[PDB]
Amino acid sequence: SLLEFGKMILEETGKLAIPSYSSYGCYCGWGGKGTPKDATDRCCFVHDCCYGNLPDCNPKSDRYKYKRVNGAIVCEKGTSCENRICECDKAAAICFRQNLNTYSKKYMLYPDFLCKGELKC
Amino acid sequence: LAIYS
């Protein structure tokens, strides 16, 4: 759930997921449309697509477990859903870190009306 | 922890 994912985000970026990545661009929040603003925003886009391909699950609420081994996130072994949700989160957390380089403050608190158009996964 | 809502 948001609890584990947020821990990963902090671990990988040194930033608190909320409010750093909770109102960022067009896809780092609840919104779901328009062209991602930058690399960080695309990370959220991909994350939505991953969760979007877990129909048989409950991404935001299902609690899962994981641990770090040699500095790299390692998803433990839970139910099918737990491992898949954990992987989706891991990929995003790492994506955020890889692109901290281009994280822009100007995309924080981004107005949703500035995002229009469906971008298929 | 905080998450991207």
Side-chain angles (χ1 to χ4, degrees), chain A residues 6 17 29-30 48, chain B:
Chain A
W30 305 89
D48 293 326
Chain B
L1 216 346
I3 193 208
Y4 107 62
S5 159

Side-chain angles (χ1 to χ4, degrees), chain A:
Chain A
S1 67
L2 288 51
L3 165 48
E4 291 67 56
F5 184 27
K7 176 184 181 187
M8 270 186 224
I9 296 177
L10 177 58
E11 263 158 33
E12 296 296 316
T13 70
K15 295 178 177 292
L16 285 293
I18 299 173
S20 294
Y21 294 98
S22 53
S23 66
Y24 195 104
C26 293
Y27 294 85
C28 299
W30 305 89
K33 38 231 175 190
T35 297
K37 305 306 299 181
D38 56 5
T40 291
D41 201 15
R42 282 194 295 280
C43 291
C44 293
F45 178 77
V46 174
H47 192 252
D48 293 326
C49 293
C50 200
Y51 271 19
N53 273 279
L54 301 187
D56 59 306
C57 311
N58 279 290
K60 297 100 71 296
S61 66
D62 196 5
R63 307 288 298 301
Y64 63 77
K65 184 169 301 294
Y66 78 89
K67 188 56 194 169
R68 195 170 299 291
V69 172
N70 269 17
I73 299 179
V74 183
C75 291
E76 307 293 56
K77 214 63 184 177
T79 62
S80 175
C81 280
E82 276 157 41
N83 280 72
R84 282 177 287 161
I85 292 172
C86 177
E87 292 298 334
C88 286
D89 290 356
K90 172 179 171 174
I94 291 167
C95 184
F96 291 150
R97 166 170 64 59
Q98 302 182 315
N99 299 290
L100 267 178
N101 224 165
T102 51
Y103 177 108
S104 296
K105 298 177 173 186
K106 66 170 183 299
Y107 291 133
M108 296 186 67
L109 299 172
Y110 202 76
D112 101 290
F113 79 92
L114 295 181
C115 309
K116 295 308 166 192
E118 185 57 50
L119 177 57
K120 283 157 279 295
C121 288

